Design an enzyme around this catalytic site. Structure first.
Site, PDB file in Angstrom:
ATOM      1  CG  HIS A  69      -2.035  -0.929   1.189  1.00  0.00           C
ATOM      2  ND1 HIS A  69      -2.629  -1.482   2.304  1.00  0.00           N
ATOM      3  CD2 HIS A  69      -2.727  -1.397   0.123  1.00  0.00           C
ATOM      4  CE1 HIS A  69      -3.631  -2.257   1.927  1.00  0.00           C
ATOM      5  NE2 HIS A  69      -3.712  -2.221   0.609  1.00  0.00           N
ATOM      6  CD  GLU A  72      -0.476   1.026   4.388  1.00  0.00           C
ATOM      7  OE1 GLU A  72      -1.677   0.993   4.059  1.00  0.00           O
ATOM      8  OE2 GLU A  72       0.189  -0.008   4.602  1.00  0.00           O
ATOM      9  NE  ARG A 127      -6.650   0.104   0.193  1.00  0.00           N
ATOM     10  CZ  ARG A 127      -6.465  -0.327   1.439  1.00  0.00           C
ATOM     11  NH1 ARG A 127      -5.902   0.465   2.343  1.00  0.00           N
ATOM     12  NH2 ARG A 127      -6.843  -1.553   1.785  1.00  0.00           N
ATOM     13  CG  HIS A 196      -0.097  -3.537   5.412  1.00  0.00           C
ATOM     14  ND1 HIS A 196      -0.900  -3.156   4.360  1.00  0.00           N
ATOM     15  CD2 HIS A 196       0.301  -4.803   5.143  1.00  0.00           C
ATOM     16  CE1 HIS A 196      -0.993  -4.151   3.497  1.00  0.00           C
ATOM     17  NE2 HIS A 196      -0.273  -5.163   3.948  1.00  0.00           N
ATOM     18  CB  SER A 197       1.518   2.083   8.586  1.00  0.00           C
ATOM     19  OG  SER A 197       1.160   3.048   7.611  1.00  0.00           O
ATOM     20  CD  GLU A 270      -2.445  -2.597   9.317  1.00  0.00           C
ATOM     21  OE1 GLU A 270      -3.282  -3.140   8.566  1.00  0.00           O
ATOM     22  OE2 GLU A 270      -1.899  -1.505   9.045  1.00  0.00           O
TER      23      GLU A 270
HETATM   24  N1  LIG Z   1      -3.045  -0.837   5.630  1.00  0.00           N
HETATM   25  S1  LIG Z   1      -4.716  -1.075   5.820  1.00  0.00           S
HETATM   26  O1  LIG Z   1      -5.091   0.033   6.647  1.00  0.00           O
HETATM   27  O2  LIG Z   1      -5.056  -1.136   4.430  1.00  0.00           O
HETATM   28  N2  LIG Z   1      -5.245  -2.573   6.557  1.00  0.00           N
HETATM   29  C1  LIG Z   1      -4.998  -3.921   5.949  1.00  0.00           C
HETATM   30  C2  LIG Z   1      -5.306  -5.166   6.890  1.00  0.00           C
HETATM   31  C3  LIG Z   1      -5.029  -6.549   6.311  1.00  0.00           C
HETATM   32  C4  LIG Z   1      -3.737  -7.147   6.380  1.00  0.00           C
HETATM   33  C5  LIG Z   1      -3.502  -8.434   5.821  1.00  0.00           C
HETATM   34  C6  LIG Z   1      -4.554  -9.138   5.186  1.00  0.00           C
HETATM   35  C7  LIG Z   1      -5.834  -8.558   5.116  1.00  0.00           C
HETATM   36  C8  LIG Z   1      -6.064  -7.282   5.675  1.00  0.00           C
HETATM   37  C9  LIG Z   1      -5.903  -3.978   4.683  1.00  0.00           C
HETATM   38  O3  LIG Z   1      -5.275  -4.459   3.591  1.00  0.00           O
HETATM   39  O4  LIG Z   1      -7.045  -3.638   4.641  1.00  0.00           O
HETATM   40 ZN   LIG Z   2      -1.882  -1.257   4.163  1.00  0.00          ZN
END
Ligand SMILES: NS(=O)(=O)N[C@@H](Cc1ccccc1)C(=O)O
Ligand SMILES: [Zn+2]
Length: 307
Positions: A69, A72, A127, A196-197, A270
């Site tokens: 993403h 982030e 994103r 991620h974040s 995250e």
């Molecule tokens: N960075 S985020 O805020 O997009 N949260 C993530 C959470 C997530 C992480 C791994 C697998 C499924 C979901 C997302 O892809 O929605």
């Molecule tokens: Zn993410």
């Protein structure tokens, strides 16, 4: 700029600076790290993966990807720090040294190159990828909804304009298929970590189904331990659990895919913070974030090498 020793780890960088960084690291530690190109992005940019290895033949490996993403930024920055950290701790830290003497580590600092470049030139909060869809003016697919794990089910959008658009079909995004092919071809990965974040969470499968994974007990204990280690540096509090019960239902996620491939230790981090700055985390928090996150990843690696 001249060497990884003069590179500024306490600030955010552009794609080119990160790519140059990779070449400097390989040139400085040729016997430990090598740069591999596993594919090219939609817009033709090379997709690079750094391999840290002390030798051996197809030793079990650890996969770590950051920036799927693009907005982030804390993830790609933490990735650059990790790369340097590996070369510095091998032979200095007993635990990490033991890990690298028996396992390989594959690090993908910029999993979504096109999106990253776009966050620098047009939209800081972009994103998705930058692929063009046939019947729509909207661009991009949520690369973390494009994997073959409950693909197209609740937790993703069929609308091209949606922030969570899953795409035409599983693995349609070259940025995703490039990883899928590499991991399947390798066949010996034991851990799969996707960074991620934000919101400070340590998550394990699943996100697309309410079904509990058979390794629930072990992964939960590992997560608990990783969270405790990470907290020890600056007191940063993390929550942990399965994706669906801890954040929300999400289909086509990468760790759900990796876990179904037999890679037991599949986790998603995250990172900071909890909302005060969100995706726009100050550069002053880069180092401390990476340092604490390292302790959490090391903890998971340790459990992997022994199990
Ligand atoms: N960075 S985020 O805020 O997009 N949260 C993530 C959470 C997530 C992480 C791994 C697998 C499924 C979901 C997302 O892809 O929605
Ligand atoms: Zn993410």
């Amino acid at each position: 700029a001249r060497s990884t020793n003069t590179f500024n780890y306490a600030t955010y960088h552009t794609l080119d600076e990160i790519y140059d960084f990779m070449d400097l690291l390989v040139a400085q530690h040729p016997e430990l790290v090598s740069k591999l190109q596993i594919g090219r992005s939609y817009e033709g940019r090379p997709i690079y993966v750094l391999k840290f290895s002390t030798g051996g033949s197809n030793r079990p490996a650890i996969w770590i990807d950051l920036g799927i993403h693009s907005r982030e930024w804390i993830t790609q920055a933490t990735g650059v720090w990790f790369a340097k950290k590996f070369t510095e701790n091998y032979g200095q830290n007993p635990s990490f040294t033991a890990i690298l003497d028996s396992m390989d580590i594959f690090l993908e600092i910029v999993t979504n190159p096109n999106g990253f470049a776009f966050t620098h030139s047009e939209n800081r909060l972009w994103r998705k990828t930058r692929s063009v869809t046939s019947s729509s003016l909207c661009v991009g697919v949520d690369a973390n909804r494009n994997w073959d794990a409950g693909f197209g089910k609740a937790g993703a959008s069929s609308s091209p304009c949606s922030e969570t658009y899953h795409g035409k079909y599983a693995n349609s995004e070259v940025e995703v298929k490039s990883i899928v092919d590499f991991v399947k071809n390798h066949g010996n990965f034991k851990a799969f970590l996707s960074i991620h974040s934000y919101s400070q969470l340590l998550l394990y499968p699943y996100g697309y189904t309410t079904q509990s994974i058979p390794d629930k007990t072990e992964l939960n204990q590992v997560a608990k331990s990783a969270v405790a280690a990470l907290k020890s540096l600056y007191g940063t509090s993390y929550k942990y659990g399965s994706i669906i019960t801890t954040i929300y239902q999400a289909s086509g996620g990468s760790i759900d895919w990796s876990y179904n491939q037999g890679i037991k230790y599949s986790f998603t981090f995250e990172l900071r913070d909890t909302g005060r700055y969100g995706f726009l985390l100050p550069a002053s928090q880069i180092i401390p974030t990476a340092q604490e996150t390292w302790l959490g990843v090391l903890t998971i690696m340790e459990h992997t090498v022994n199990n």
